[PDB]
Design a protein around this ligand. Structure first.
Ligand SMILES: [Ca+2]
Ligand SMILES: [Ca+2]
Ligand SMILES: [Ca+2]
Ligand SMILES: [Ca+2]
Ligand SMILES: [Ca+2]
Lengths: 255, 255, 251, 256, 250
């Protein structure tokens, strides 16, 4: 089982030597390390938290490059919109190793984008975007994302038969084939759409009105079963204690 | 969070000094340490396996005694009927510390009995039995147990307001109040039914026709959230890889 | 002639639920239940309020027609039974002014007097006698040992208008003196303009304590009578039933 | 674009009496009155809340639409004028959570932040900056001198989501730094959420005064530093020169 | 084995909720979490580092109180004077639970003080101090401490027969009986209550790192833990430092 990338932010400020802030603009919001006001475990549940309102963010982590050619690609992470978000992204981008991390921005060329996007009551959507022939192609299926304040697990699975699966909280919510669920081409044909020569950076590149979202437990792997295990060892261990602590705070607030 | 008992059989043959065979009869079947023919992890998934057909079994483990008076009691363990069982029990019993472990048998006085029981096409049931006023009182709700070959998590939660909950695979399948869901009394009124002065031994005391059932990951605790965590760190880590290995063996069999 | 300001024996089934009020100051207070426990002198008479949950704060109270002890003897009396062999927890009462909001009662609510047994581990087996004076809660300076076995014990506080006091356990004096000598107060120290509520407001690790036979009166002799009609009637049969259960346990 | 969470200039006659609430926690609180005092830049503009009684506690507060500073800059700003040449008394504000019962406000009510000048005798001329954290009221460890003459002075506190702060007097910086360094909150790096409060709903004047006569005016709670500075120049900055001129004239007449 | 206290600072900033700064003075030096310039493992070898020169320090950790009465008491921790110290303490103090951690200072009443003290070429000494009858009684044996830049394990063993042993780097350096090796005025060894471990000390050149604190009643367990901590640090630390010394020379 290949682990191309793992990040749990368990080693204090260690993460500040693994991630790079884009300088494309001077006024990007800053991520901070935090487990927020409630959590399952104060230390384990530390992740990157958006710290400023109405800002663009642009922070990224490089890893030893790889190709998903001939293989399964699994992209997984947790997202927690502690602040009860009104409008903002919670998605990740996988970039070719040719990306200059210090110049990353909204129009930098990525391979794949994946994850939750919220904007008002009307948009609660999971993006699955594939870059193909210089276009960023959006999935045609409507996948609802989570919108409460708790930690949710997001998983994208992409297979070399051009099938894909999306999971939320380790449970399937959408499935199918690339050729059907995106408009890449007028008719069937190109079995290589799923495949990228090179993956070298994972970026958080996004916009937020109300800030406070925490990203944790990032995993890039080629094994679906391992992804599921890791999901149960991370999200699955956070879940119940987080909910208990938050119920308790809600009750005290009410009094 | 109090952990009154935990057993995962992770330290080789260490378990043989924690569990005691009843000598009440000379012909009890024997438990053996085994992860069986398929598993998620050959080592982690070791547990106690029934090794002989058409036998009574009687093995138990003592722990520092406790009372659940004024507190939540959670009893949890995994069961795997690898052999595709026809008829046999998969339940545990919690006994007072006054039990002589070398004389344990079917008629020994327990406090609580909990878990799956299978007998032919008609019976796939989860027992929840409370000992009260010298009677063993059986739950009136019909709870279906699992019957496939895979590992399943069984959880009983008993609370000091006389509520209870039963979970399978970390997900609620039944809930209510002791006074409603058992015939202890003709009408309501004994709020202490849930409570026992002492718990000192967990026993596997049961009958099996076709043998091969594996018991693992026993937990007795006072914390529902911790039980759920441990469930996701045990069953939740076994699940996907176990299924994948077994599908592979089924496919090889078909050829 | 004796004035009875408050009496509670929990003799009329669930009648008590309309005389006592649960504080809602917090959402996770432990709950009292009506019970005579596993052993008793009389299954019905020895019903009282039992703490039902471990490691919890409790806050339950009862009102009565307000009164003042000014110019009078005040006697506060009740039974306490730590069935569970308590490790750490209170068994004391508090007398409050009628200005107390019973639905907001908690550890920091202002009381007039606090009285009764407090146990915490090997070191503490003590009877509290606390007087509220000049916005301070003043603790008795004498060391009074409380009972700690599993049986029912009678606790009695007597306060007199010459500022003398007496403490009794099981109807027998264990301590006495004057307010001015036995507390560090900043002449009617003893006196309160009004009493309107009795509260059980306390903490408990191991739960199972039973409170019964509460009495507030102005007559020492009557308190002693009532003690002998309640505790004194419980005592022997309770001990006998428990001895029998201990013997069966051993076999 | 700047958010204005609270503004009070007392420009609309007795209108303020429907925006502020007196605590009844005690029966003998001093009373605020509307006044521009004996000298002023403009008789009407410079009306504010004046302490009217000697040797008293005061407890008056105003609500606003609740907000959180989470992920944002918080600016708290107001003018203070100790006309009476104060001997001993507070001139500071408190920002409270919306859970405060205004009719029970007092010295021990739980606030989020306290900010402003405190004078007591020759030794104490100090600007308080207090943060409530983990049930403690933590006092700034830097020594900031307040103004003590009879004129109107502008007090501004700026708190930023990187846990930096700045204090200004008369629109000019007098102190700055980081929350982790300038208060004793906790060991190590610090806690990136210290600056942040889930909610702000009430501004209170809750304080003690020997010699009375202090006037509070031109309150502003905003999320924009630049706007705070503008408003400061449109209020204090417009009061300043005329106030000083009228007072010089009165001092000269007094001499003759 | 009873483990009354263990601290390895393995859980990021988790330690900031276990340790309390004294406010007795306003100008105490500040401890910072760090593995320094060289180490065996960047993560494991994080500990509390003194961060300022010519300062008093006063930081403490409470634990569930206990008594050593009728038992062995073992106090153990690692000390690394990375800065090549000129003058400064590297010792711990065990306090009764009656200590106000927010007022801890040099004159607070402790039960036992133990560990290295360096001041100039003349003083390289291991303190073992027992509080008895309101006096702080100093061991009368001369125990040399380590003074290089590397991580060293310090272990004090006190037994209910009034014997004691001192180890450096898991190897005995001193032993005897309380009655012979101190001038006390039979349970000298015993204290009713232990509730706080404090780092309360003075330092000229700063940079000392404390890690791997252990309070236990089992000598063998202390030795095991020493080998799993100091014993796992030692070789890789030395390797990394040799490499840095060579590069510095060129
Ligand atoms: Ca994490
Ligand atoms: Ca196992
Ligand atoms: Ca009764
Ligand atoms: Ca005005
Ligand atoms: Ca360490």
């Amino acid at each position: 089982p290949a682990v191309y990338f793992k990040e749990q932010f368990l080693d204090g400020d260690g993460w500040t030597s693994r991630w790079i802030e884009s300088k494309h603009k001077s006024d990007f919001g800053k991520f901070v390390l935090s487990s927020g006001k409630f959590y399952g475990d104060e230390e384990k549940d530390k992740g990157l938290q958006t710290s400023q309102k109405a800002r663009f963010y642009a922070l990224s982590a490089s890893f030893e490059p790889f190709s998903n050619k001939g293989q399964t690609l699994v992209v997984q992470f947790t997202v927690k919109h502690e602040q009860n978000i009104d409008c903002g992204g919670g998605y990740v981008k996988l970039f070719p190793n040719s990306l200059d991390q210090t110049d990353m921005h909204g129009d930098s060329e990525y391979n794949i984008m994946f994850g939750p996007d919220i904007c008002g009551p009307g948009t609660k959507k999971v993006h699955v975007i594939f870059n193909y022939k210089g276009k960023n192609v959006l999935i045609n299926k409507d996948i609802r994302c989570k919108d409460d304040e708790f930690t949710h697990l997001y998983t994208l699975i992409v297979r070399p038969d051009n099938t894909y699966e999306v999971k939320i909280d380790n449970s399937q919510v959408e499935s199918g084939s690339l050729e059907d669920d995106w408009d890449f081409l007028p008719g069937s044909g190109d079995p290589s759409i799923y495949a990228y020569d090179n993956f070298g950076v994972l970026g958080l590149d996004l916009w937020q009105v109300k800030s406070g979202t925490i990203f944790d437990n990032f995993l890039i792997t080629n094994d679906e079963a391992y992804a599921e295990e890791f999901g149960n060892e991370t999200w699955g261990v956070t879940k119940a204690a987080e909910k208990q602590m938050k119920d308790k705070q809600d009750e005290e607030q009410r009094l």
